[PDB]
Ligand SMILES: O=c1ccn([C@@H]2O[C@H](COP(=O)(O)OP(=O)(O)O)[C@@H](O)[C@H]2O)c(=O)[nH]1
Ligand SMILES: CCCCCCCCCCCCCC(=O)O
Ligand SMILES: [Cl-]
């Protein structure tokens with residue numbers, strides 16, 4: 001595929017899910033070979049694994065004293081559309097959460113794609129790898145296409161289930177929203193997070209219930225969202241990725257751990 005940028009400046013704004021603060025996003029076109037980077041208070045922060053500063057309840061980036069929370073959703077959309085050269089200017093401390101999915105980013109950017117004058121240099125998984133953490137497991141292996149499977153095993157009604165993304169099925173995952181369990185809310189608030197969370201941007205689930213009156217868009221919506229998150233974290237390899245991935249109960253911390261091991265092996 002050819003390198004891509006946006007045809008013009010695109011704007012997005014709203015509350016950040018963790019900070020509870022209003023922020024604003026300006027996506028700027030860039031020339032061939034620039035890569036994906038964030039820009040904040042005069043500082044460029046590359047969308048790369050070396051710049052990850054926190055992974056507990058979001059993927060956060062930082063450099064030279066400037067930090068940006070919650071980059072996983074904008075990065076997943078850029079990965080899915082193969083946008084390879086852009087600057088994401090952030091006025092604020094967090095990416096806006098919007099409805100908790102990738103849909104608004106996806107629809108706006110999809111309409112404004114500009115093919116450029118270079119063949120993409122893909123990060124291609126060259127051999128099988130497995131990373132583990134206390135129950136959680138991710139494996140990666142060589143493939144001509146990006147294929148991503150998440151298997152969840154949840155302690156509520158969701159139980160054990162599985163969803164697989166393959167290339168060409170981007171529309172199946174960009175609408176899936178971020179989710180939280182009711183028993184997790186106290187912890188999240190107590191560590192100084194979740195300040196912008198509500199039923200308008202978060203699916204809140206109990207042992208037996210869905211609090212959002214709109215309910216779930218899909219029966220496996222949370223698992224589709226986890227696939228969407230992993231594709232965002234994978235873009236921290238610095239280029240679009242070619243590989244087959246299986247994740248059992250993974251989250252941002254394990255995703256970033258796999259990315260770091262893949263990077264140092266050097267694919
Ligand atoms: O299939 C799963 C199951 C759990 N989790 C998350 O990972 C954490 C692990 O929780 P666990 O069931 O292991 O019990 P805990 O470690 O919180 O005591 C939970 O907060 C879940 O939000 C997940 O991402 N995928
Ligand atoms: C109805 C208001 C309650 C919302 C408070 C919870 C805040 C949502 C936190 C999002 C969960 C983290 C997801 C993640 O990034 O891995
Ligand atoms: Cl924490």
Ligand SMILES: [Zn+2]
Nearest residue numbers: 001002119120
């Ligand atoms: Zn090509």
Ligand SMILES: [Zn+2]
Nearest residue numbers: 056057187191
């Ligand atoms: Zn925590």
Ligand SMILES: [Zn+2]
Nearest residue numbers: 057058059072
């Ligand atoms: Zn997240």
Ligand SMILES: [Zn+2]
Nearest residue numbers: 072178225229
């Ligand atoms: Zn997410």
